[PDB]
Each structure stands twice: as structure tokens, then as C-alpha cells.
Amino acid sequence: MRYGFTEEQQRFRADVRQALRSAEVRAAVADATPADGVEPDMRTLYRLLGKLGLLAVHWPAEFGGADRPLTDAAIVAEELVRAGVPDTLHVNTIQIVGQFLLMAGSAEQKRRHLPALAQGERFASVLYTEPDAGSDLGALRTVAEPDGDGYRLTGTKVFSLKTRFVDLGLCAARTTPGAGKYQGISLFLVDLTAPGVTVSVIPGVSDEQFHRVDLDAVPVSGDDLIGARDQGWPLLNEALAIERTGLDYFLKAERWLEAALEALADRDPHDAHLEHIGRFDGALAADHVLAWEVLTGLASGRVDPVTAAVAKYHSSELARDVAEWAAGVPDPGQRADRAPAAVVLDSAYREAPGLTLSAGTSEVMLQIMATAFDSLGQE
Amino acid sequence: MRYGFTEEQQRFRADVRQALRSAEVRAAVADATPADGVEPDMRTLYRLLGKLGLLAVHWPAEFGGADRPLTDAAIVAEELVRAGVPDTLHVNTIQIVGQFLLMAGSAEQKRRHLPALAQGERFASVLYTEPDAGSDLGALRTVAEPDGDGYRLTGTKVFSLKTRFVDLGLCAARTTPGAGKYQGISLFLVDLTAPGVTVSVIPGVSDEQFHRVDLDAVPVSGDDLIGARDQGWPLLNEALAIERTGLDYFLKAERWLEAALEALADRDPTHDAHLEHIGRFDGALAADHVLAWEVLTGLASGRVDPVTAAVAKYHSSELARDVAEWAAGVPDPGQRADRAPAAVVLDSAYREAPGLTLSAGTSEVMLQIMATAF
Amino acid sequence: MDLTPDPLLVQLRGALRTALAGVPVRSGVHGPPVADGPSGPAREVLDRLGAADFERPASAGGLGLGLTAGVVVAEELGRAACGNPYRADALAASLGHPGGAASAGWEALPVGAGVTATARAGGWDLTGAATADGPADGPLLVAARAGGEPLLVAVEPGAPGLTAGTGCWPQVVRFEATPVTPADVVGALDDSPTGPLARARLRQAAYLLGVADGAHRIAVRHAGVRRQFDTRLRDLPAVAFPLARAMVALRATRAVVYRGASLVDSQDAGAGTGTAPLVALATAAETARDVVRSCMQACGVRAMTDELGLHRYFRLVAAEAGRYGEPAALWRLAGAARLDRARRAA
Amino acid sequence: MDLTPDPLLVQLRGALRTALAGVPVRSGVHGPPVADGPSGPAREVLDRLGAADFERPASAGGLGLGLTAGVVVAEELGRAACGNPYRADALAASLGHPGGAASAGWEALPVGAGVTATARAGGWDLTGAATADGPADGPLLVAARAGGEPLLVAVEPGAPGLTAGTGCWPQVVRFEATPVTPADVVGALDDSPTGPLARARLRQAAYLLGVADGAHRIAVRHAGVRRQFDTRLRDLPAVAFPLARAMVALRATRAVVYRGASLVDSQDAAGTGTAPLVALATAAETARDVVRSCMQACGVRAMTDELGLHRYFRLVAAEAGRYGEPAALWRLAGAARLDRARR
Ligand SMILES: Cc1cc2nc3c(=O)[nH]c(=O)nc-3n(C[C@H](O)[C@H](O)[C@H](O)COP(=O)(O)OP(=O)(O)OC[C@H]3O[C@@H](n4cnc5c(N)ncnc54)[C@H](O)[C@@H]3O)c2cc1C
């Protein structure tokens, strides 16, 4: 083991950090930060991040990347959030939809789709959840009935973020209904401009809003079914497990703990808070290590669902605990004055309930952990 | 709603307090208190309490009671524990076994068996759990094969308390085996001296020890079958439901929080670090006291609300466990070395604590019962 | 003790419940979840039922129902999620002061510490900031602290040095050397057992109990209709067990809130009487946080949207759980009283 | 942040685990759960494997595995529930003092405040009581506080005003004006990130990590065999979920314990200052929460010798607070962190 980073990694971090601290970036970050229930357009910021080559530094150069190790993209992700960049568009486009075309797409689809994502010109979101399919995702009823060498998709997708701002939708559909719960399912890269797509908002307490996507006989080209036909169910699970690190929640918790310290520091002398500050800073320390534990292994081809579930659970739960505690830290004057710490923590409280629900619920993470109890290589 | 006791109740309570503070009772209590892994004989104490008429005040006079209301017996129960009396025998003999006999026994069985219990001369354990049947009590395998008018009993009972000091065992056995999981179960009041009984001790981390009871064709009279034959499963859970109040755990939590305050106050002053916990536990103690009496007020009127009883049991036993865990860290090293009386009770409290969320229905079963109110 | 329901109050609760159910609820998912202040939309229903006279004794012209009735009103107001037009005018009336103001500064412990009053010639000067329970630009009742004496000060709407922050919710009032005189003092805010502060804490505890209770009601209801893996959510141990634990906390909170209300009423007519308002408030603040977090998890994303109505209780607990002080801080105040009673016993 | 495994520690752990699995475990359900002190039944195993030379560096003829080896030893001792014949000697060795002493007094915060050293007459006297990790009638190393200065003090047995609380466990030592000189000061117990105190806390944190891990192993196995309602206990969510949560805390504890030892070894060869506090406070809480859950998941058997959990249950009772209450360690850690946010 070695806790901490290589001098070469620290030098690459410092250049990213400096690149994100320019006037151009800081101005655009100010304009795009969700706050007070308003979710601003981020397309300009992300164009600028693509120009700086920061969106997908670990992708192949043919596709917009810089051929860097995966751990280098984790260092960028860290510094993006520490510089104020709202990251949900990055997580859905680069870390979920982008990672999935890399893993399961053909050269024809990899080349047609990946580059505009790496440049911040095009965006995607994940259209899995349905009104009757949340935790029970195999209950999805969206159907992709054949049309020549293409398909027509009819269904209802709910509770996605950023969707009214994006171009593409990774959509799970039954290419063979009647095939049993977890059979007959394929993935589509749906063009959200196509006829039959209606996107609308489901208001939520968070700054970033949820969406309903109605699909009424939407045409999907055959070259947009990505992965093996009807083998969609295993592909979603593989993609989710590869995606799970806990890094994104670790960074929300670090931001919020740091906002709460800012609020407290700019105020007269806090014996009440000391214990929470201590435990939260230690749990953050544990959580940084767990997150990088899964990235290290992912960097070396090792996939390990249990350690990834541990990190997701520990980090999402900690971020909720930090948000709940820290929302009470700003005093009335700071709330009245809109001290930036207060703004950030008001957002955090309203965001917190989702963290133990998105990308696998806390209950499903525990189920995945119990998997280890039946393994002979437990110790 | 009266959060408090009438003048007639507190006159009763203070008389019972005085009766429990005579030099004879104090001496018996001190010789009988379990500590340091030791479980002394308390039959001489319980005979003193029977002689004073404090074991079953709510029972009918013909059975050795005073025909006082159930709420007078909760007053007595509270004052028993507050006087230092170890109460496991009272709970098992009077509040479980005796209550069952009053609820399901014939007028003969109540006459033949109840008066000695009310006088503190005989005692009873509860023999339900079996090696393969803990939470899943319907998996019990003890069989009661008929033998003329009576029965013989074969099976194994484990994890009962006080059993090597008691005379009777309330035993669940399959009278008609193979008739289904929750069918053909009967309750027998077994004489523990009868042939083929083997009581023995399973060592336990706590002061009071667990027991294994061995029935090899143990012969039991037909008049020792309490309640309707083969109807034991609904009777048994009806009785457990009536015994559920949370009061017994409330009084443990009270004893332990007062011991920790005594340890804290016996050492020179502000104790700033303990203040939040003392506050929360005192507040939860007051909530727990009301939840217990919410059950008693209901029981006294003749309504059994199993959800309310389940709330009180869960809140008091989890509270008592939490108090035990925190309070065990309060005595200082000097107090442990000198065996300050509060350090001794708190050492006992810590090793008792794990069992509180398991006995008389686990925490998980209470939540299951609670889920039916949805 | 006997805890059979009082028949007069069961009727009073029933009447409040149905009339408050006739008050439309705020329809947004953003912004203030309620319109509170002395004259929010539920004022008409409270006026019609004569709630302003519930607490005042019969000899003073009131109905002589006591603080217990005040607690019922506040709980039913919390369950309805329609805002709280009772709490500020009940506090003022307990001090012989006419209504219509917003109350502010309760969040600071010790009482009044968020607004310090420093002695001047003809009075004091106020500096600090404070959370209001009503319009920050209206008349105000401010908990302030003069040399360690906690007091309640009436402040007029356009007093000098007074800035109203109406952007946020709950709204905020700032004082920059705002001047008050001895005539502006509405009353002391001491730790007396039947004093205005103690009643105000019990009313706030009751309000939090109703909020948690309303939230729990809708999660239990949703858990009964929402199905996944072909079973009711309420039939899955991982959802039902957290909902059953919240019920325990709600019942524990109901126990201390109504014990505290009954003990105050007892002393008004006739061990730990002094701490009962704190015990009730601190249990209710923690219960509301613990209940609402569990309800949100049990209902999934829908908890975050207007598909359910949980979101109004969610934002309410954010503001109300600490408006009368942080629970750990309340618990430490309760703890010192208990330990001090223990030092005296030895 | 590279976290792939190192062969040398891997061999060390395997040799400890195999060797310690032979050590006989004390068979009572009452009394002390382990034989503590420098001469326990695991002392023989540690001596064979040369534990004395583990933390010894490349210079001065030592193995060269650093604090991390000490943490590995302490984790396996806790896992085996065989006693800790290592911590007192390793504390003494880090200060050049000869072995053989029990150490005492770490439970008080600020460090040493359970035994106060008063400048009196033309001398100093120790007054207070302390918890010992070994036999209380032998030689002692006492955490003591002189005028606000935390100090580790050597006391020989039979010293004036020193009474041994033998018979309670852990054992206790009492000082009534026990006299000391500046010559008895073995060293200072300040908060330097690589001082003896920081090393002592990481060893204790690793021990608590071991004790907690050992109890979890028993519950996970017993939940795999025991069946009720014709289902394995481990397939009941009210059992599996708390065991899974305990797993998260164990892995979170492993993370800060080994990070703490690695930071110390990197300094011998930002948030560095509180790493020992962090490691100890999360291990003490983790041990307490894991053990509660394991007892509940295993039912009444957990309280009897049918399982083996009763040893770890009695250990957590004495060990979770031995080097300070977690609430208090956290407040120290939180104060340091708030300091940084002020400058
Ligand atoms: C911030 C956020 C972003 C999201 N983004 C997207 C997105 O981009 N695309 C998309 O398709 N979806 C998205 N979702 C939807 C998300 O995947 C769903 O919330 C989740 O998959 C299913 O949870 P649910 O809300 O339907 O709750 P339910 O399925 O109704 O579950 C209710 C509760 O019961 C628990 N539960 C359910 N079943 C079980 C069980 N068998 N055992 C134990 N506990 C169980 C759940 O864990 C939960 O706590 C997002 C959600 C959130 C909160």
C-alpha cells in the first residue's frame, strides 16, 4: 500500500487545479451552479471543460481522450468538484453512458458517439427507471418492437436528472417481451429529439429536477442498439458495478464539511460542534481510502462488487449525515446575508435524501455485501 | 389523563416502601443480590415478601392475593426493584406462570397450585425454548405421549432462568404430533422433582445463569395440563401478550441511570462531558415510564392492545440496554477498585444488557407486531 | 397513573382535524412549505373554533382548557402542514400582550444569546440576528439577552438598525444597535416551570410531534400501495422495520409532550417538573429528524417530489427541529438539572 | 493512492495468524477474558517470531517493517482474543526503557489527567487511580500530568502510597502522594505526530480492529448454520443487514488504522496530526457497534460458551475506552481541524 499520491500525480493534479482556477472557468462556474431551487444551463461550462481536455482524460485519443490511466480521470473528477463544477452532467455522460459505449459498443458506434461527449458538445442521461420499476428494474415494461432493421420504442421513463438538457438517452427496452423478467432486454442510445419523445419535469425539492420521458413509437436505428441484442440485463449490471466507486459522494461530503467549517470559522468562539467535526473528518478520511481502493483495483482489471458496495454505502451515508448536520451550522445572519457556505449547505440538505437512493439504494448495497458471507475467501 | 399517582396510591406506595425497608428485609436483600458472576439463593427473601403479602396483591384472596387492582401490583413491582429485590423469580413465578394459571387453569389447578406461589414458598420457571426453537417457537419437538390418564414428557428445554432454584416448570409439548406446526401443542405444569428431569446450568456471561432441562419420559398427571388440550399455541401467545408491559425494563434502566449519577456525584466536581447523555436518558426514562403505564391502564380496563404493549417493551428494553452500555463506562478506576456499590451494580448491568432485547420476545419480533398496525 | 383519553379533548382534536383539513396546503415544491405568521391561511379556522381562548382561565374569560389544549392545537397544526398561526399569539397572550407579531430568536441557547442588549441611558441597544416564525418585516417579539437576564422585546416594523431578511425561509431579522426602552420589554424569559418560555417550548414540541406524525402517516400509506418484486413495500422487512421504529419514537414523544402539558396545568390549578418542557422539546426535535429521514428512505425518489406530499414535512423539520434550540444543547441543560439533583441527594 | 498489497506484511500476517491459532484460549465465561501482561500465553509465539525486532528500522539492526508491523501484530492478537503481551513492551521499547512493565492511565483525557503530579515540598507526588493493561503489582508505566504537561512515569512496585487493585479486571492502580523525581520520567506524551503516544494509540486502534473483526467472524458463521422458520439466520434481513453494516465499519476502521501507521512510517523514513486520534476513535466506536450487533444476531447463545462471542464481548467492555472515550477523542480531533479552518 501507499496512502497519498505520486509526485507525478501531484504535479498533474496541480495543473488541473490551476486550469480550473482561470478567470474564464471561475466566471462560468459561477453562472452554472444550481442554488435556491434553480437549475441553470451548464452547456457553456462543459464546452469550456471539453476545450481544456478535462472531460475524459482516460479515454482513447481516437475518441477525445488523452490516453491516461483511469486513476488520472479520478484525480480530475476530484478537482472538478473542488473547483465548483456541477458534476451530474459529467457523471451521467462520461462516467455512465460514455463508459458503457466504451465497454460494449462497436467501432461504428464508439466513433460516431464518443467524441462529442469528450468535447462537451453532446450529453446523455440514463433512462432506466419506470413508474412500476424502481428497485425492481426488471419490472420495466418499455417495449422496442421491430421495424425493418430498426425499432419503435413505447414506454415511460421517470426520475432521470438533466434530461431536458441532454441529447441522448441510454434506454432499456424489451426487444422480446414474454421472455421472462430478466430476459429479452436490450439497450438503446435514443436521440431525444426523435418524434415520439416528450420530456417534462417532475418537480423535486433538490435544485436539480427530475424528468418524465414518454416514448410513443419512437424510431431507433438498428446501429443504436448497443451491446448484444436481448442481452441488455447483464450489460446494465456490469456497467453499474464498474461505475460504483464512492468517489462522487466522498466529494459531496468533503465540500459540505468544508462549507460548514467556513461558516463556523467566520464567527465568534463552538464546543458543541467539535465532536461532529472530528468524527466527520475521520470518516471522510476512511472514505477517501475506500474510494481509491476500488479505483486502484479497477485500474488493474480486478472487479470486486462487495468492496464497491462498501464504498458506495459508506460514502453515500456519510454525505447524508454531513448534509443533515451541517445544514444547521449557518447562523441566522449568514442565512440572511447569503454567505456562500449557507447557500451551499441549503442546497446540500435538499439534495441529501437522494444520495442513499441513486445508483443503487443503501438496501441493495447491503444485500450485495451479504454476498461476501457465503464466500470461502472471506478472510 | 393523569401523569401521576393519586393520594391513595402514594399512601399504599409508602407503606410498601416501609415494609421493604425493615432491618430483616434489608439483610435478606443484601444476601440475595447477584453480583460478580454469583447467583445466590433468594428463597428466604421471597418467603419474607410472601409473609408480608407483597407478591400477588392483585390476586383473589382465595388464592393468596388481596384483590387489589393490577395497578396496585405495578406499584408493588416498582417498589420491589427500587428496594433492591432481585425480581426475576417474581416475574417468572407470579407475572408469567401464576398469571397463566389464573387465565387458563381450572378452579382446581388454581387451588392446588396458586397459594404456595403467592406465599413465596414455591416458584416456577418457564420452559418453552428448545435447542432448535428460539424465535421460531413453533418448531418445538417436545412430545407428550399419553400414559393412561396422564402423559409422559420427552424433550429438551434450554435458556430458562432460575430453574435450578424452582419447583415447577411451565412446559410446552406436542400432545398430538404431526398435526401441523402450530397445532397439537399443550402446556403442562411439570414438577421438577418428578423422575427423568435433569436440570443443569449453561454458563452465562451475566450473573443469572441459563439452564438446560432434560425430560426423559417425565411422567405428568393429567390434571397438570393447563388449558385446553392441543390449544397451547393460542393460549401461550395470549399469555405472553398479557405479560408484555415494559415495566420490568423501565425499572432496570432507572436503577442503572441512578447508579451512574451516584457514581458521578460521589466524585468531586461539573462533569460536562456526561451532561447530554444524562439528559437524554432521563428524558427517555420519563417517556418509558408513561409507555409502561399506558399498557397497565389498558390492561386494567380489560383491553389487550398488542401493538401498545410491543411499543413499550421495545422502547424500555432498548433504553435499558443503552443505559447499561453507557453507564458501565462511568465509574472511575478508583471506584472499580474499591467496589463502590454503584460500580458493582453497573458491572452487573453491562453483562445483563445483551439479554434485554432478546427475552420475552426479541426486538425484531416487537417491530413485526408493530408492523400490523399499518 | 391513568392515561385514558379525556373526552373533551378527543372532541377538540376531532374538530381541529377536520377544520384544518379544509385549509388548502401550499402547492410548491420549492420555497416556504407553509405560510406561517399570526394571520396565515389557518387563522380563520382557529378564530372560528375560539382557539385564542383555549389556554386562558375561565375567570379571565377563557375556556379554562389549559396548555393541554394549546398542545393539541399545535400538534394538529403540525400534522396538517398548513402553517402555525397559533404559536406567536399564544406566547404573547401568556404575557398580557396583544397579538399580531412574529416571534424570533429562540434558536440561541442560552435564551436570548443571539440578540444581545447592552445597557444605554434610556434602555438598551440590540445587536444580533434571529430566526422569525412570521413576516420578518412586521412587528416582532424578540428573545434578547441583557447582561445575562433573558427578556422578550417588542420591536416596531421600521425601527432603526432593523433589517428584515425575507429572501430565506424561515425568515430572519437583523438588529444593528436597534434601540428599545424598558416599556418595550414584554416580559422576562426565565426557566420557571410554568413560565412563558416553558409553555412556548411545550407548544413547539407539540408542533414537531404533529409534523413527524403527518410525515409518518403518508409513508405508512404509501408503503401499503407501492409494490416492488410483487410485494407491498410494508411487507419488506427493510422498509417495515424503519417505519415501526419511527412509530416507537412518535409514541415516546407523545408521552413526554402531553406529560409536560399536564404537569404545567397541574401546577396552575393545585421530582423533575422543572425539566419537562426541555425533555418534551428535545425528544420531539430528534424524533422529527429521525422519523422524516426514515419516511424519505422508505418512499424512494417520490418522497422528494409532489407525488406524495412528504416534501412539506421534510422542509418543515429542517426549520422547526432547531428553531427553539439544538436538542443536544437542550439535553445538556436537562442533564445539569438532573446531575445537580443527584449532587444534592449525596 | 496506491493500495495494492505488499508481500512482506502478507507473510508476517500469515505467520502470526497460523501461530496464534495454536494459542489456548481462556475457558471461563466469568473473570478476565484473557491473560494480559507481557508474559501471556501468546508471549511465546511473539518471541519465537521475533516481534521485538519488528518495528526496529533498517538502521540499528532491525527487520524494518515500521509501525505497520506493530499494527499487524496488534490486529492478530485482538482477532485471536488471546491477550495482548505486546503493547506495554512496545511502548517501553519506543522510549528505550526495559521491558516488563504494565502501562496504565491512558483512559483519562487530557492525557495523564487521571494521575496528577503535584510540585510539593522539594519534590513531586503522584495522586489518582489508573487502569492497567497488565499485572497491577508489578512495575508500571503511568500516564501522568504535571502542571499541564503529559508525562510517562516509571514506578517500581512497593512504592510509597501505591496500592494495587487486584481482583477487578482490568486491574487498577492507586497513588496516594506517591513520590517521583524528574529521573523517573521515561518521556513526554505530547501530540507530536510520531511520538510514543501516537504510536501507542495506533497499536490500540489496531487491537480494537482485531477484537471487532474476531467477533464478526463468529456471528457471520453462526448466522450461516443456525436456522429458524426454515431459513438461515443470514437470509433474514434483520440479521444480514446489521452484519453487513458491521462489515462497512470494519473496513472503514481498517482504512484509517493502516493509513495512520503508514503516515508514521513515512515520517520516520495537512491531516497528519490527527491520524492517530482518528484511527483510535473510529476503532473504539466500531468495536462497540459491531459487538452489540453480533450479540443480537446470535441470540442468547452469544451470552454463553456455546459460541465464543462472550470473550470479545468482555474485551470490548474494557478496551473500547482504555485509551480514552471516543466522544472525547473526537472533540480533540475536531478542535484541531477547526484550528486549521481558522488560519
Ligand atoms: C438523485 C437520483 C437520481 C436518479 N437518476 C436516475 C437516472 O438518471 N435514471 C434513472 O433511470 N433513474 C434514476 N433514479 C431513480 C432511482 O434509480 C430509483 O430511485 C431507484 O432505482 C428505485 O427506488 P425508488 O425510488 O423507486 O424506490 P422503491 O423501489 O419504491 O423503494 C422504496 C424503498 O424500499 C427499499 N426497497 C425496495 N425494494 C427492496 C427490497 N427488495 N429489499 C429491501 N429494500 C427494498 C428501497 O431501497 C427504498 O429505500 C434516480 C434517483 C435519484 C434519487
Ligand SMILES: Cc1cc2nc3c(=O)[nH]c(=O)nc-3n(C[C@H](O)[C@H](O)[C@H](O)COP(=O)(O)OP(=O)(O)OC[C@H]3O[C@@H](n4cnc5c(N)ncnc54)[C@H](O)[C@@H]3O)c2cc1C
Ligand atoms: C435473558 C433471557 C432470558 C430467557 N428466559 C427464558 C425463559 O425463562 N424460558 C425460555 O423458555 N426461554 C427463555 N429465553 C430464551 C429466549 O426466549 C430466546 O433467546 C428467544 O426466543 C430468541 O431465541 P434465540 O436467542 O435463539 O434467537 P434466534 O432465534 O437464534 O434468533 C437470532 C436473531 O435473529 C433474529 N430473528 C429471528 N427470527 C427472525 C425473523 N423471523 N425476522 C427477523 N429477525 C429474526 C432474532 O431477533 C435474533 O436477533 C431467555 C432468553 C434470554 C436472553
